Amino acid sequence: KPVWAPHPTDGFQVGNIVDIGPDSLTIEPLNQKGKTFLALINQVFPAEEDSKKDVEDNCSLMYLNEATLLHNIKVRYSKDRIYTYVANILIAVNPYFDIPKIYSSETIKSYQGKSLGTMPPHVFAIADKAFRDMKVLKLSQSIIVSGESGAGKTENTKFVLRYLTESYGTGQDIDDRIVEANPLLEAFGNAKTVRNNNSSRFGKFVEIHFNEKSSVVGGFVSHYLLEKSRICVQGKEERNYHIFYRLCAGASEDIRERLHLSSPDNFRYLNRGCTRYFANKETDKQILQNRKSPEYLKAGSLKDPLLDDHGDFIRMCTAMKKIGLDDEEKLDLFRVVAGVLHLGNIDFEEAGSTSGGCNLKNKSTQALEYCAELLGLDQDDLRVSLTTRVMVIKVPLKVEQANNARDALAKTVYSHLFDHVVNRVNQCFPFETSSYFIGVLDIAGFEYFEHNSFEQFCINYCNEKLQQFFNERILKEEQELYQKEGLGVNEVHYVDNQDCIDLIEARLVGILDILDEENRLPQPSDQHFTSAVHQKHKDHFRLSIPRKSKLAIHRNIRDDEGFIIRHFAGAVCYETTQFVEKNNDALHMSLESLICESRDKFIRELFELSFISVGNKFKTQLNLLLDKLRSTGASFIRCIKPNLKMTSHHFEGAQILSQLQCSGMVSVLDLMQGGFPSRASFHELYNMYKKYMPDKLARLDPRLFCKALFKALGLNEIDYKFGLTKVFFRPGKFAEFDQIMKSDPDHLAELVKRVNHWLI
Amino acid sequence: KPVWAPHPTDGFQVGNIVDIGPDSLTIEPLNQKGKTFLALINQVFPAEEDSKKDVEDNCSLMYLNEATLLHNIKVRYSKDRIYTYVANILIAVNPYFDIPKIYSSETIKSYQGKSLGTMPPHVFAIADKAFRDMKVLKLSQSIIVSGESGAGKTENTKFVLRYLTESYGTGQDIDDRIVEANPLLEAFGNAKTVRNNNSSRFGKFVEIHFNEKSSVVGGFVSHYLLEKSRICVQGKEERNYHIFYRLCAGASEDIRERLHLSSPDNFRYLNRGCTRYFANKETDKQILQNRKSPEYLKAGSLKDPLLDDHGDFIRMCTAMKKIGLDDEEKLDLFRVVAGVLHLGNIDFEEAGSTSGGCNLKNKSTQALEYCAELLGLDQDDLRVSLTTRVMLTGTVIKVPLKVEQANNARDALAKTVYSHLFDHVVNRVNQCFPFETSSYFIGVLDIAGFEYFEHNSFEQFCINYCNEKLQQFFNERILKEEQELYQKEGLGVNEVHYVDNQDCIDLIEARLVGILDILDEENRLPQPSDQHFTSAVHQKHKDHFRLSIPRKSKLAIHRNIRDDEGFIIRHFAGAVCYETTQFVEKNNDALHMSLESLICESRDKFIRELFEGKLSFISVGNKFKTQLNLLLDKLRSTGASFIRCIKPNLKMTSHHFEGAQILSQLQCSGMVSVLDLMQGGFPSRASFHELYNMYKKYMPDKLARLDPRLFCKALFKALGLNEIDYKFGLTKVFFRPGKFAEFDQIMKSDPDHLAELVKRVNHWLI
Ligand SMILES: Nc1ncnc2c1ncn2[C@@H]1O[C@H](COP(=O)(O)OP(=O)(O)O)[C@@H](O)[C@H]1O
Ligand SMILES: Nc1ncnc2c1ncn2[C@@H]1O[C@H](COP(=O)(O)OP(=O)(O)O)[C@@H](O)[C@H]1O
Ligand SMILES: [Mg+2]
Ligand SMILES: [Mg+2]
């Protein structure tokens, strides 16, 4: 009798149905006899009889639906239980505080070799299940950690890597080198955004490699789309990459003087964003007064439970030394960071024309001197390369063009530094050969804002391709297997997004190749690119002009000023201004030659028609990643952001429900509950027990020995289902399935004995 | 200067640009000063300076666009010139009257061995180009004749076959035999529809086979999807297959009495359609009064320039006798036709409570007697098989049928007997021109043309799915492979992007989730439902570009159709809304075992030969998919030539060019896109190495010393070709449209010809 009905902020609320209408139900809310509200019949759900209980696996609920799912994970969250299963899929709700001892070395040990369901839900169990599948099925594994910005993807990725390296690594300098290399990646690739204080501005796939003995030999980090625009400008509530602030706050006085550093407000590439440090009462005392910006002295430090610019610098330097980076290497990295900062301080003024173009302002001499010294460049060569350009003819630049050459040089130098850092990290844990790998995927999900540019376009392209993988693995392949085995499982359908992917990535006519065409034209134009997209995709369902938008804020955007992509996760209107500029990874040959001919060996090694497609380079990386994903066994962790305020114990029902809906988790609740996540063929099960079986058992058809074995083990006909060639085990039966699958000879003998006792 | 701007019925109208706005052009129509209309900038095209002229190849126009194409086709049509090229593709506009001597034996001879462009555009030239390619390239050929219903596909297919057999045959009756057998195929496979008085209700692929000497050895006809529903019921403006009317109108009194025939109004399988004969003042006098239905006596005869039920019967019988069918065989065919007619006259009535079944009405005794006698069946065996169904239970037992189920068993038996008769007729025709072995073939494809009506069923669905598949072959061969070749050769030809029609194929034939497979699933269920099938289609294909619910239709006649009662398929040739009622029934080719056993165990040797507890199910859709994939493998393995037929109006009238209707066909056929791609296309090509090697034993040292490309350049220049006519690629030399004659001269391997051209090069080499 009480049901779940919609609630604007809680998602659902308890009530009683008092009336019915076509398409509607009248709901009386709990302890409010008289008051009523209407709801569409498909928005009203049965509730669990016991409202105080919680289940570890959502598949155990009497009624599995979006409302019961939300309530179950709510109750668990209020008891600081952030992990809950949906069969072998994990849901992780960001606690926004450190829950005591749930990631301890003791907690790690307790999860080792334990079947799913034998221990409470946890990321450690997902990591252990991937290890056991790799070890047993002799197949590489993938762990996909999904969710919105601030959901907890990066944190759960670290928990997976720590679990695997601590458990299946002997305990060696080599073994720790995968975990210890992380503060280095975050310093150069993470930054403070409005949604996350430690936002990842690059995607990653971290592979832990194993030998034949299922022991860690080493690892490999693949990185994607480092956000270039952040290098030069940030919003007032955002910062540039952590490294700049860690170096400004933590460097020794000798380092600060050698790099000519000062408080962040002195650098153009930092002073448009927030120049405040992450610090507490203690660490603020360790930061010298000369490193503190006026804003930091007025507003105080930024607050975060773990981020600390001074502490993170010391930790970073300690990690660098432990993984094998010497001081020379460390100082070379800092020199480039400082060089990039001084570069941003170079200002230009119009020349008297007469002679056209621009000059460096006399106030920029000191910045020019510092930048050229740190980048090992000749001062006049840098001065010339920032105010002129070559195109056959050398021509002067206007102020605006000079500001752009300076910003292009900074973005390219920094991006090349990040690539060096990722390669250097890979060089700490290399391996001659491996049998298998366990790969963890940590990358930004589908996103949109008021104004959508190339960055959003690239990320949303990635998630259109990943979505196809998710649909194919969880829905298409799973339901196909049930069909081929004649299990009669109720069919769950999905919209195929191959055409959406085609729109973007089709050869010649794909958006990426149309964009490439534009970059190779004599007069490249964003308007011309956008027109060529609309002209080449007239009848297309997925492609629309901005004037067809539902939102009024887009109706004034011209046909040649944008496009609407009807993505699987919802329509996104893109403003196409600067798509041509952002699509070029190549530095102009005049700037390229200048930096390649540096006096510094380190700088030259960063760089060891100027056009390199950002979109097509990314498509090639994405396809390689997708080939690895498709060739491996896949495990999924869906991270949930509980609120928009980074607060603990603030479960926002409506916001959480929207993520459960949008992620597609709801659409698969009935598939997953009425599914069979564990399976084995009757022949392989029979062949494994064959040498232990007596004639009475051996004479039987494989199907019949399996039947006898399951019955002797106290399994009911509900817990499993026999197909044509395979036996299938329901969710919540992983422990029993692993007991049936255990190949240990003493174990095989022991079970044959149980069968013999059951037959008598 | 005057331009082409849109016109609602003419497609385009000539006008002058007087103003310009942000998205428009203000047009003043010709000779109408002061009057104006707005058009989108994208919809206004340059016109040819000379409006009275016409060009034989549309590639010759100064401005190649849809408006100039339409006008060129129009001007030629007004001068009774129904054929026009788009390089090596032919456009054929149905004249709807006999143009004098353009298909004469004299016209046939004049096209023999002539290169494209040397003679006016004509189907004979497409047939000759296919012959020359087969002889020279040692590769089988296919001629694809496309277009909607009434466009002229069947007529142009006949012209091709007559040309090839008359030109490249023995000279005896053996070549004529392929042509002479046709009245037999049309009598059994063609019928009067609202779009065409002689509509083809089956698809065909006619192969003319050749020996090593490129001489006709024989032929082979492949047939696809004869329409089953027409055998039993037709609309008031349509008829059943021609044979029924030809036999009713032309049979001798002894034949009429032996088959117990009468006027068409006496048969259920004819009296729901139009029972009027095709006749003129003269032939109506040859039809006896006892053959004439009340409707024929009231409304008079049906009018057609060629179709005549009395005359076509005599012609059919004359053709049968000439190709080798004796009277025994002829009478056996007529007997089955009459047996099918009498079968339809068997009516049923409720049996009562005791058995919840039915009985034959006492008024149906005579029909039962006649049917059983003509089909060589026992009367009581037929009575039992039409009113009962055998079931398992494991003892064999019968279960009574309800009236509706017995009407269906009767109709299933008629459709199966008739279909088996048509298969026999196609095989018998193949037996008239067999061959032990052949080197190559020239195949002509004449499929049932794209058609839609007020109400669209499974027949239209199957027809249009096939018309779709052949548009995909055209797209793949002309618009895909062509541009890929130019790319692989580095020619830098401007890329043409067309809307593909593959997504529509996928929707229909995709495994498991395809419409054909979902329909088979439905037939295999305990309670098969059309609504359940339609729901499954909509559920598995959400937001598809080619799938839509019927209420989303543009036409008012489809907006009251329920979601589970139909679907809209967006075909390349225009959106079609299908009513899905009876899709499950029409998708079953199988006859229930009781009816199958009854017809296989006939007393008649002819009937038995027509025919060689579980579910009786054979998929019509998947059987058809398998035939089409086989045909498509054959097409993909041959050199392809295309003829695009155009229907000028919806009234079957001559000298009525409907611009808007014609333009729509030019758009939907991909001709508008082909024209674009020929602005820089190269339909003729050859390896310069293979070309150099062919002349090497004839060329002097001065030329032999040169790089192959250089001898080729010397040869092209010596032959008066300009640098604009040709283009060198990485491995091939390419020639622009309008240079076929010159390219064929370059390619001629005849040693005397090779020597003669080397002499021309030596004269050019001063
Ligand atoms: N399991 C967790 N335990 C403690 N704090 C967490 C946990 N997961 C996330 N957080 C907090 O939330 C922040 C955002 O998490 P993060 O992994 O960076 O998100 P994402 O990578 O999805 O954007 C963290 O920096 C941390 O403060
Ligand atoms: N070239 C032609 N010359 C004379 N009559 C023609 C010609 N093409 C077609 N017709 C007329 O138009 C009718 C329809 O032609 P048909 O070839 O049967 O069309 P389709 O097979 O494409 O539906 C013919 O029966 C004939 O009356
Ligand atoms: Mg992250
Ligand atoms: Mg026809």
XYZ file of C-alpha atoms in Angstrom, chain B residues 402-749:
348
model
C -14.806 -21.422 -39.069
C -16.258 -19.755 -42.251
C -13.433 -17.126 -42.292
C -10.763 -19.890 -41.970
C -12.323 -21.951 -44.852
C -12.431 -18.778 -47.111
C -8.681 -18.460 -46.286
C -7.870 -22.165 -46.986
C -9.692 -21.799 -50.375
C -7.751 -18.560 -51.175
C -4.392 -20.094 -50.037
C -5.005 -23.099 -52.352
C -5.848 -20.771 -55.313
C -2.735 -18.550 -54.701
C -0.431 -21.572 -54.419
C -1.868 -23.418 -57.474
C -1.647 -20.193 -59.591
C 1.889 -19.296 -58.348
C 3.060 -22.855 -59.198
C 1.459 -22.428 -62.665
C 3.434 -19.158 -63.183
C 6.721 -20.952 -62.156
C 5.844 -23.682 -64.701
C 5.268 -21.016 -67.397
C 8.671 -19.351 -66.639
C 10.406 -22.779 -66.781
C 8.584 -23.698 -70.018
C 9.755 -20.390 -71.566
C 13.347 -21.154 -70.426
C 12.983 -24.554 -72.187
C 12.332 -22.707 -75.538
C 15.944 -21.264 -75.695
C 18.314 -23.481 -73.606
C 22.102 -23.685 -74.059
C 24.665 -26.364 -73.083
C 27.376 -23.736 -72.260
C 28.093 -19.977 -72.716
C 31.130 -17.662 -72.292
C 29.298 -14.388 -71.243
C 25.775 -12.977 -70.820
C 24.004 -9.624 -71.212
C 21.333 -9.368 -68.514
C 18.381 -6.945 -68.516
C 16.762 -6.090 -65.221
C 13.061 -5.223 -65.277
C 11.785 -5.071 -61.736
C 8.243 -4.249 -60.624
C 8.253 -0.432 -60.473
C 7.979 1.721 -57.354
C 4.228 2.224 -56.639
C 1.980 3.597 -53.912
C -1.760 3.905 -53.661
C -4.439 5.186 -51.198
C -3.777 1.939 -49.192
C -0.256 0.388 -49.051
C 0.146 -3.273 -48.059
C 2.896 -6.024 -48.013
C 3.003 -6.196 -51.852
C 3.977 -2.491 -52.055
C 6.313 -3.012 -49.098
C 8.197 -5.831 -50.923
C 8.179 -4.015 -54.368
C 9.472 -0.749 -52.814
C 12.121 -2.623 -50.708
C 13.442 -4.119 -54.047
C 13.245 -0.667 -55.880
C 15.269 0.593 -52.888
C 17.992 -2.114 -53.289
C 18.516 -1.322 -56.961
C 18.848 2.454 -56.157
C 21.602 1.348 -53.661
C 23.398 -0.617 -56.431
C 23.167 2.556 -58.631
C 24.557 4.704 -55.728
C 27.418 2.206 -55.024
C 28.445 1.837 -58.701
C 27.898 5.383 -60.048
C 28.327 7.693 -57.048
C 30.612 5.703 -54.725
C 33.050 3.474 -56.780
C 33.422 6.253 -59.415
C 34.632 8.952 -56.942
C 36.800 6.341 -55.141
C 38.502 5.529 -58.481
C 39.159 9.262 -59.151
C 40.674 9.507 -55.576
C 42.886 6.335 -55.927
C 44.107 7.885 -59.260
C 44.694 11.339 -57.704
C 42.516 13.216 -60.281
C 41.315 15.887 -57.787
C 37.675 15.700 -59.028
C 35.270 17.798 -56.871
C 33.512 15.464 -54.391
C 29.737 14.961 -54.669
C 27.805 14.030 -51.511
C 24.404 12.364 -52.068
C 21.872 11.160 -49.503
C 22.546 7.429 -49.200
C 19.632 4.905 -48.961
C 21.514 2.132 -47.081
C 19.973 3.134 -43.685
C 16.524 2.257 -45.189
C 17.883 -1.262 -46.249
C 19.246 -1.832 -42.726
C 15.808 -1.006 -41.205
C 14.156 -3.669 -43.396
C 16.616 -6.617 -43.660
C 18.835 -6.333 -40.577
C 19.288 -9.618 -38.748
C 17.138 -10.241 -35.714
C 16.049 -6.613 -35.372
C 15.111 -6.067 -39.012
C 11.494 -5.764 -40.071
C 11.675 -8.981 -42.122
C 12.971 -11.016 -39.125
C 10.436 -9.424 -36.629
C 7.654 -10.419 -39.111
C 8.984 -14.052 -39.245
C 9.035 -14.045 -35.360
C 5.314 -13.079 -35.416
C 4.404 -15.950 -37.806
C 6.253 -18.346 -35.407
C 4.226 -17.247 -32.282
C 1.181 -19.202 -30.865
C -1.125 -16.174 -31.417
C 0.258 -14.235 -34.454
C -0.851 -10.533 -34.373
C -0.283 -7.704 -36.976
C -0.566 -5.136 -34.066
C 2.117 -7.037 -32.032
C 4.403 -7.125 -35.095
C 3.905 -3.309 -35.759
C 4.572 -2.540 -32.041
C 7.826 -4.602 -32.087
C 8.933 -2.627 -35.189
C 8.316 0.769 -33.475
C 9.904 -0.397 -30.130
C 13.170 -1.717 -31.720
C 13.515 1.296 -34.088
C 12.926 4.432 -31.910
C 13.823 7.819 -33.578
C 15.028 6.111 -36.826
C 15.414 8.526 -39.745
C 13.518 6.098 -42.097
C 10.791 4.874 -39.587
C 7.758 6.924 -38.400
C 4.230 6.376 -36.901
C 1.295 6.912 -39.378
C -0.157 10.040 -37.638
C 3.133 11.933 -38.499
C 2.045 11.718 -42.217
C 1.702 14.715 -44.562
C -1.447 13.190 -46.190
C -4.798 13.454 -44.300
C -5.889 9.937 -45.475
C -3.203 8.406 -43.065
C -3.715 10.520 -39.872
C -6.423 8.280 -38.378
C -4.252 5.072 -38.666
C -3.252 3.738 -35.191
C 0.456 3.342 -34.116
C 0.116 -0.500 -34.075
C -1.747 -0.497 -37.445
C 0.902 0.955 -39.642
C 4.290 2.550 -40.240
C 5.827 5.174 -42.530
C 8.939 4.124 -44.478
C 10.893 7.028 -45.936
C 11.951 5.508 -49.295
C 14.505 7.377 -51.572
C 11.521 7.894 -54.059
C 9.236 9.427 -51.346
C 7.646 8.521 -47.948
C 5.207 5.608 -47.979
C 2.697 4.906 -45.204
C 1.965 1.191 -44.907
C -1.169 -0.333 -43.316
C 0.247 -3.420 -41.518
C -3.036 -5.458 -41.459
C -2.492 -8.935 -43.077
C 1.362 -8.508 -43.166
C 1.541 -11.726 -41.060
C -0.806 -13.605 -43.470
C 0.898 -12.307 -46.663
C 4.347 -13.220 -45.231
C 3.486 -16.972 -45.360
C 4.237 -18.846 -48.599
C 3.407 -22.268 -47.011
C 0.213 -24.217 -47.537
C -1.203 -26.264 -44.728
C -0.264 -30.011 -45.072
C -3.919 -31.035 -45.678
C -4.129 -28.755 -48.767
C -0.562 -29.487 -49.955
C -1.095 -33.355 -49.823
C -4.437 -32.960 -51.655
C -2.926 -31.051 -54.628
C 0.256 -33.229 -54.817
C -1.919 -36.406 -54.970
C -3.989 -35.156 -57.971
C -5.206 -37.619 -60.641
C -3.695 -35.239 -63.248
C -0.046 -35.749 -64.241
C 0.185 -31.978 -65.141
C -1.093 -30.843 -61.672
C 1.276 -33.283 -59.791
C 4.232 -31.983 -61.895
C 3.383 -28.319 -60.933
C 4.101 -29.515 -57.317
C 7.405 -31.544 -58.053
C 1.677 -31.763 -36.366
C 4.339 -29.054 -37.164
C 3.910 -25.341 -38.167
C 3.398 -24.631 -41.894
C 5.585 -21.507 -42.392
C 7.785 -20.291 -45.314
C 8.822 -16.589 -45.089
C 7.852 -14.540 -48.226
C 10.076 -11.620 -47.105
C 13.200 -13.629 -46.302
C 12.804 -15.871 -49.409
C 12.707 -12.567 -51.431
C 15.746 -11.078 -49.582
C 17.737 -14.264 -50.475
C 16.733 -13.970 -54.176
C 17.652 -10.245 -54.276
C 21.083 -10.835 -52.607
C 21.826 -13.533 -55.236
C 20.768 -11.107 -58.033
C 22.873 -8.344 -56.459
C 25.987 -10.676 -56.386
C 25.412 -11.281 -60.146
C 25.015 -7.478 -60.805
C 28.135 -6.650 -58.722
C 30.176 -9.210 -60.807
C 29.193 -7.590 -64.178
C 29.693 -4.311 -66.017
C 26.542 -2.180 -65.408
C 24.593 0.139 -67.754
C 21.572 2.256 -66.681
C 18.337 3.408 -68.276
C 16.244 5.759 -66.134
C 12.572 5.678 -67.331
C 10.349 8.711 -66.627
C 6.535 8.787 -66.420
C 5.461 12.177 -67.940
C 1.935 12.446 -66.423
C -0.666 10.490 -64.307
C -3.218 10.170 -67.149
C -1.456 7.821 -69.694
C -1.595 10.648 -72.295
C 0.934 11.564 -75.002
C 2.366 15.177 -75.349
C 1.652 15.988 -71.628
C 5.008 16.794 -69.989
C 4.305 17.524 -66.260
C 7.412 19.459 -65.218
C 7.034 19.178 -61.389
C 6.289 15.398 -61.578
C 9.210 14.797 -63.985
C 11.613 16.969 -61.894
C 10.737 14.914 -58.733
C 11.739 11.679 -60.584
C 14.999 13.317 -61.815
C 15.730 14.321 -58.183
C 14.772 10.971 -56.490
C 16.652 8.842 -59.168
C 19.969 10.579 -58.374
C 20.245 12.020 -61.904
C 20.492 15.580 -60.491
C 23.645 14.313 -58.498
C 25.072 12.341 -61.443
C 24.976 15.577 -63.593
C 26.920 17.493 -60.919
C 29.674 14.827 -60.759
C 30.025 14.847 -64.649
C 31.092 18.578 -64.563
C 34.455 16.944 -63.705
C 33.802 13.220 -64.307
C 35.609 10.853 -66.695
C 33.400 7.917 -67.853
C 36.117 6.381 -70.091
C 39.478 5.214 -68.769
C 42.302 2.767 -69.533
C 45.754 1.856 -68.246
C 48.396 3.891 -70.233
C 50.820 0.939 -69.717
C 48.303 -1.559 -71.355
C 47.753 1.081 -74.115
C 51.551 1.558 -74.695
C 52.035 -2.307 -74.703
C 49.299 -2.760 -77.335
C 51.083 -0.286 -79.762
C 54.735 -1.176 -78.792
C 55.349 -3.758 -81.615
C 54.059 -1.158 -84.186
C 55.740 2.037 -82.865
C 59.210 3.173 -84.134
C 62.225 3.671 -81.776
C 61.551 7.498 -81.501
C 58.228 6.683 -79.726
C 59.300 3.356 -78.074
C 62.141 5.213 -76.215
C 59.474 7.476 -74.576
C 57.794 6.964 -71.200
C 54.292 5.333 -71.841
C 52.465 8.626 -70.878
C 54.452 10.472 -73.636
C 53.528 8.052 -76.426
C 49.869 8.345 -75.186
C 50.112 12.195 -75.265
C 51.633 11.955 -78.795
C 48.823 9.583 -79.877
C 45.994 11.775 -78.354
C 47.434 14.954 -79.992
C 47.846 13.201 -83.413
C 44.090 12.279 -83.162
C 43.038 15.947 -82.678
C 42.171 15.620 -78.973
C 42.650 18.753 -76.780
C 44.286 18.730 -73.290
C 40.800 19.378 -71.772
C 39.392 16.068 -73.167
C 41.712 13.854 -71.115
C 43.571 13.571 -67.864
C 46.388 11.331 -66.678
C 46.218 9.644 -63.316
C 48.719 7.433 -61.469
C 48.021 4.293 -63.568
C 45.126 5.263 -65.941
C 44.258 7.841 -68.641
C 40.723 9.293 -68.287
C 38.428 10.855 -70.943
C 35.645 13.417 -70.445
C 31.975 12.748 -71.537
C 31.397 13.363 -75.249
C 34.724 11.630 -76.142
C 33.453 7.973 -76.333
C 34.010 7.752 -80.117
C 37.676 8.863 -79.852
C 38.300 6.629 -76.753
C 36.905 3.530 -78.625
C 39.273 4.352 -81.547
C 42.246 4.550 -79.139
C 41.176 1.151 -77.527
C 40.651 -0.784 -80.832
C 43.178 -3.762 -80.752
